[PDB]
Amino acid sequence: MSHHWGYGKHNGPEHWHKDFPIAKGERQSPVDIDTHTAKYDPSLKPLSVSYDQATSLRILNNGHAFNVEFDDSQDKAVLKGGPLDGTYRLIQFHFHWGSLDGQGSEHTVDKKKYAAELHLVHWNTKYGDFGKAVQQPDGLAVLGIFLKVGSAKPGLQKVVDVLDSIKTKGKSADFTNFDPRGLLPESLDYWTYPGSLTTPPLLECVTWIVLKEPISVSSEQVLKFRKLNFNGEGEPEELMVDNWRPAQPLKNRQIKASFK
Ligand SMILES: CC(=O)Nc1nnc(S(N)(=O)=O)s1
Ligand SMILES: [Zn+2]
Structure with a gap:
């Protein structure tokens, strides 16, 4: 049991993977x-x-x-x-789509799946930039927002009018004075799921968070995107969805979370 000191055969070889706690x-x-x-x-x-x-x-x-x-x-x-x-400061985010006319999100919480979800990427400003954050595991984290269908437009009539302007991809439109808080609550408690990507052991500077209070969205908001192209006009009528991710459950004993 006693480990005799004075040697270090394992302390000899050193590689990239053996350097970081990725492997x-x-x-x-x-x-x-x-x-x-x-x-x-x-x-x-x-x-x-x-x-x-x-x-x-x-x-x-x-x-x-x-x-x-x-x-x-x-x-x-x-x-x-x-x-x-x-x-952690936020700069921008985007939403994914689904292949089905009812559901088709990335991950699935509470054994339930949504149609779309927001992706808000943030980086610890304490370390300056993501460049210095990637230098450590607990450097930069990623916030995962989900969207649920309610079929109840929360007063986004105007949001639909301006949408008719971005029918085709590749263009832009100046739009300020947005109210993202009107749908986002204070949010005190929330579940979590830290770890690494689904790709080979390379980097683990990414965390996956999940709020117990996902932002609500009406089916009418996405009903407009259904008629839009997946990459500019002139292409065969196809869905713009392209954010599918597997997650077969092996067993799942207990998952860490700030909320019950
Ligand atoms: C390097 C990189 O960021 N790749 C992905 N970007 N985010 C993606 S997503 N949300 O469409 O799955 S592809
Ligand atoms: Zn995304």
Whole structure:
């Protein structure tokens, strides 16, 4: 049992994978999030998030997929809470689509699947930029937002009118004075699921968070995109969906979460 000191055969060879805890901690395993098995963990530090200045300026398309831009020139919204060593700022996000006329999201929570979901990427500003954050595992994290269908337009009539302007991909339209808070609650507690990507052991500087209060969206909002092209006009009528991800459950004993 006693480990004789003075040697170090294992302390000799050193590689890229052997350097970072990427290979030493392989958690690459896609699985559906379960709320029933989730457990409340009040270990995190309760904090208050901001989002009063949060506002958009315009929306640019990439000829297929577009993301919403925000004015980082001010203190829009910031996230904080837990053993984190720095606050997380948000810059932009996008939404995925589905192949079915009822559902088709990336991950599935509470053994349930949604039609679409928002993808808000954030980077710890404490480390300066994502470039310095990627240098460590707990550097930069990713927030995963989900969207549920309610068929009840929360007063987005105008949002549908401006949409007729971006019928084809590759164009843009200036749109400021957005109200993303009108649908986003304070959100105190929320489940979590840290780990790495579903790709070979390379990087683990990505965390997967999930809020217990997903942003609600009407089926009428996506009913307009259904008629839109998947990449500019002139192409065969096909769905713009292209964000499918597997997650077969092996067993799932207990999942970490800040909320019960
Ligand atoms: C390098 C990289 O970011 N790749 C992906 N981007 N996000 C993707 S998604 N949300 O469409 O799955 S492809
Ligand atoms: Zn995405």
